[PDB]
Amino acid sequence: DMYIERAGDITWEKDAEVTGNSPRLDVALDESGDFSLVE
Amino acid sequence: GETTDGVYRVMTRRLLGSTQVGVGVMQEGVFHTMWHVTKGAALRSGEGRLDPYWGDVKQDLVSYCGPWKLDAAWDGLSEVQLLAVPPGERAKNIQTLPGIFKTKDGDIGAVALDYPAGTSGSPILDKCGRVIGLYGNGVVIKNGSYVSAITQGKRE
Numbered sequence: 001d002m003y004i005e006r007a008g009d010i011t012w013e014k015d016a017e018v019t020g021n022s023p024r025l026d027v028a029l030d031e032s033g034d035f036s037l038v039e
Numbered sequence: 040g041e042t043t044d045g046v047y048r049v050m051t052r053r054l055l056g057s058t059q060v061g062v063g064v065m066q067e068g069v070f071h072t073m074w075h076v077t078k079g080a081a082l083r084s085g086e087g088r089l090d091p092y093w094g095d096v097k098q099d100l101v102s103y104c105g106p107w108k109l110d111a112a113w114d115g116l117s118e119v120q121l122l123a124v125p126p127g128e129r130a131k132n133i134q135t136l137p138g139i140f141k142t143k144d145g146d147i148g149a150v151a152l153d154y155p156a157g158t159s160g161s162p163i164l165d166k167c168g169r170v171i172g173l174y175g176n177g178v179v180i181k182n183g184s185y186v187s188a189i190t191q192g193k194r195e
């Protein structure tokens with residue numbers, strides 16, 4: 001059996017870690033809810 | 040049980056030790072998470088019984104104790120934050136600018152951050168704090184890394 005344990009508050013924190021890129025990717029979604037890379 | 044509005048971990052004692060299968064969002068008496076995390080199975084909070092209410096495998100979303108409440112939307116231009124709750128580590132707000140997923144049913148936002156599969160169901164936040172979607176379902180890229188869609192449900 002699964003259970004939940006609180007992990008914190010939902011707040012936008014200023015001066016936080018700004019990392020990560022912004023990629024435009026062509027994808028397709030299937031009946032099983034899975035994304036696929038279409039090229 | 041504990042229905043205090045906030046971000047929660049989704050744990051299981053079925054495997055060796057306690058294993059974090061995902062993350063969720065408690066907002067307005069409803070616990071919103073990704074479908075592949077629980078698979079529509081009843082959860083437990085302290086002693087309380089959290090029973091499923093709504094779900095969809097294609098959307099990959101599931102809501103407990105009530106209908107989907109989260110209805111914020113990405114503006115397409117602003118930087119967002121991922122309240123990343125990693126298995127075994129403390130929650131962390133990671134600010135980023137999202138890219139794009141180009142589909143046949145329109146375009147959707149995408150966060151390019153590398154995280155383990157146990158972090159699935161973590162909220163993507165805006166500058167106001169509202170939950171604009173869930174991190175956990177996307178695609179594996181040419182570099183091995185993972186790019187996740189900004190998955191948002193539907194309010195009533």
Ligand SMILES: O=C(Nc1ccc2c(c1)CNC2)c1cc(Br)cc2ccccc12
Binds near residue numbers: 032034075157
């Ligand atoms: O397993 C993952 N995601 C997922 C799995 C099963 C299903 C779905 C999504 C939706 N339809 C069923 C995953 C999540 C994350 Br945050 C990082 C990953 C890194 C590498 C490989 C997979 C993942």
